[PDB]
Design a protein around this ligand. Sequence first.
Ligand SMILES: Nc1ncnc2c1ncn2[C@@H]1O[C@H](CSCC[C@H](N)C(=O)O)[C@@H](O)[C@H]1O
Ligand SMILES: CCCCCCCCCCCCCCCC[N+](C)(C)C
Length: 285
Amino acid sequence: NDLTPHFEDVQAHYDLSDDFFRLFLDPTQTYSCAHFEREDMTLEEAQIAKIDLALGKLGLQPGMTLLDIGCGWGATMRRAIAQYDVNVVGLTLSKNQAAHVQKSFDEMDTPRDRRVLLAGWEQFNEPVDRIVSIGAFEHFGHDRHADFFARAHKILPPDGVLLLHTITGLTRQQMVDHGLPLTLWLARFLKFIATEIFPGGQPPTIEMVEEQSAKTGFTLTRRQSLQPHYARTLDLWAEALQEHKSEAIAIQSEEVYERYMKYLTGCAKLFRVGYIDVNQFTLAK
Ligand SMILES: Nc1ncnc2c1ncn2[C@@H]1O[C@H](CSCC[C@H](N)C(=O)O)[C@@H](O)[C@H]1O
Ligand SMILES: CCCCCCCCCCCCCCCC[N+](C)(C)C
């Protein structure tokens, strides 16, 4: 009981319009920090790289069941099937993403089991072999971190692994350590994000993830930062949207166009300056 998913807040963003998101996301519609392993790698190649990077840390074996909490448009799961031959289960609070993932699953010609549920992790209690979550944690809310890890720990096998990929904000002290000032623009931009882009969005700090996951019984076998990659990922998304300005205005409006350009370019500065980080936490039971 209780802890019912924050559908409205999350949907206010991801259910805007698939057509709109298609204007700037790479073809796989991955919506999270990419990983440019080769300097001249395209956004799609870098997104696939980030996918494989996360998946390869799980120790996936044929026949296992992989749970993707906050699966987005399903590229990660579809890639997990082809590259690791595992069955997949995806959770998302986005109606458009659920419909899209389902459709894409139907069009796949694989024997592996695959389904997507319009539900939060808080509503999922099925046993699974491994868990991947990329860019979803930031939406969970600090007040639910503890319960999140408890559930992940509960549904994973005794030697299960959780790959938690999430944006992390520097503590106030870390910012001071890095000589990053608390400017009016920063506070203003953050309020903007929370008000017009990601309501309910509360990125954790690094220590929050470590401490909370440790309390549950997870061991952090590795934390890997992709900070420099997000600024670039963000620039590419911003540029694509800008290249589709007229299409964006047609599908939505100039207001929405400008809102997203403001959000995309603004965040690119956050990572570029270093106010925000993005990390992959390999958590083992
Ligand atoms: N409590 C919750 N339970 C399950 N999914 C959640 C959630 N809060 C947010 N999400 C999901 O997390 C995703 C954030 S967007 C990231 C999508 C995908 N993992 C990718 O990397 O491209 C959305 O699919 C959103 O619906
Ligand atoms: C690309 C998004 C960058 C957000 C940077 C930090 C801004 C302030 C905190 C907002 C928290 C919400 C994060 C939602 C992340 C959603 N996506 C995974 C799809 C990018």
